[PDB]
Write a protein that binds this ligand. Structure first.
Ligand code: 5FI
Ligand code: ZN
Length: 318
């Protein structure tokens, strides 16, 4: 009765702050009008004025908008609306109440192989679909991996960088960045299987494979590449990681003509029914405690909101 919806900032109620950064804020919000009223979303708010200052920032912002519209997949975060005002860009994504999956590592100290297995497979599906659509993830990290309500993986940062720091690859943690990214010898589709390697390692030992005393030193360690394999590891987890964490790109598992399927065919995934896995029919090893703000804080509080970009405006179907 009266139109379709023109989604506006005033359709949402600002409930908590989930993330602050140089380029904008992530809020937790409730839709209060029309359509799903009462449903909870995450609302990423970006500052137009500062993005258009820099072309590399304009790219990711536009790409994120693109990818989230065009690349939908069960282990990738859903975009539900997008819209803009003068001076601001808004993105309303699904609210991921499970929180970060490396916070589960804080509590588990470390992840059981069979438990890491589930998370790694789902991750791989996402990465593999991401490739089928010609997208390379660059800087995958444990922060980029989140957990929906029932506790399944969802990939997360496709736009700008959360940092407020800005010192684009050296702003936050580099421990999960392939040598080539550091040697600026490009990237490639096999850069993401490195990152999967680093994540596995962390998932089992609680640390990235090579760390140093400081940046310079870190970068070094990584390039040096000497790999330390805790004893308590089963042969196949050993097997898998050797292959993945390979100095040279060409040589990593997942690099081949068909590659995320081959990664998946590895004996470490022998128990994984991809059919039901992607149907989200396997119960996840972790099911956390809808609005529950618990796993983001305590750091974040105080809710309040501070040419190109044509077609940014968007409503998801379904
Ligand atoms: C919007 C997806 C999401 C959904 N549900 C619950 N948690 C989520 N988060 C909240 C935390 N977030 C990390 C993050 N990215 C950021 C980007 C910015 C930027 F404004 F771009 F500069 C600022 C702060 C940021 N914090 C990961 C995704
Ligand atoms: Zn940055």
């Amino acid at each position: 009765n009266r139109g379709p919806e023109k989604i506006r900032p005033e359709c949402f109620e600002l409930l908590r702050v989930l993330g602050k950064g140089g380029y904008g804020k992530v809020f937790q919000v409730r839709k209060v009008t029309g359509a799903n009223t009462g449903k909870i979303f995450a609302m990423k708010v970006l500052k137009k004025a500062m993005i258009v200052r820099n072309a590399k920032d304009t790219a990711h912002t536009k790409a994120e908008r693109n990818i989230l519209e065009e690349v939908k997949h069960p282990f990738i975060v859903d975009l539900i609306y997008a819209f803009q005002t003068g001076g601001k860009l808004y993105l309303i994504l699904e609210y991921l109440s499970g929180g970060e999956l490396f916070m589960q590592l804080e509590r588990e100290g470390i992840f059981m192989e069979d438990t890491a297995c589930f998370y790694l497979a789902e991750i791989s599906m996402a990465l593999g679909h991401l490739h089928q659509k010609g997208i390379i993830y660059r800087d995958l990290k444990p922060e980029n991996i989140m957990l929906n309500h029932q506790g399944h993986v969802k990939l997360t940062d496709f736009g700008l960088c959360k940092e407020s720091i800005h010192d684009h690859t050296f702003c936050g943690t580099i421990e999960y960045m392939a040598p080539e990214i550091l040697m600026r010898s490009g990237h490639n589709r096999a850069v993401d299987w490195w990152s999967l390697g680093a994540l596995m390692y962390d998932m089992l030992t609680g640390a990235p494979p090579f760390t140093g005393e400081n940046r310079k030193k870190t970068i070094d360690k990584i390039l040096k590449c000497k790999l330390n394999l805790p004893p308590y590891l089963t042969q196949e987890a050993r097997d898998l990681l050797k292959k993945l964490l390979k100095r040279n790109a060409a040589s990593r598992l997942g690099a081949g003509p068909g590659d995320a399927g081959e990664v998946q065919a590895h004996p470490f995934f022998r128990h994984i029914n991809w059919e039901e896995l992607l149907a989200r029919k396997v119960e996840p090893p972790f099911k956390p405690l809808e609005e529950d703000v618990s796993q983001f804080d305590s750091k974040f509080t105080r809710q309040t909101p501070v040419q190109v970009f044509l077609g940014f405006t968007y409503v998801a179907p379904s």
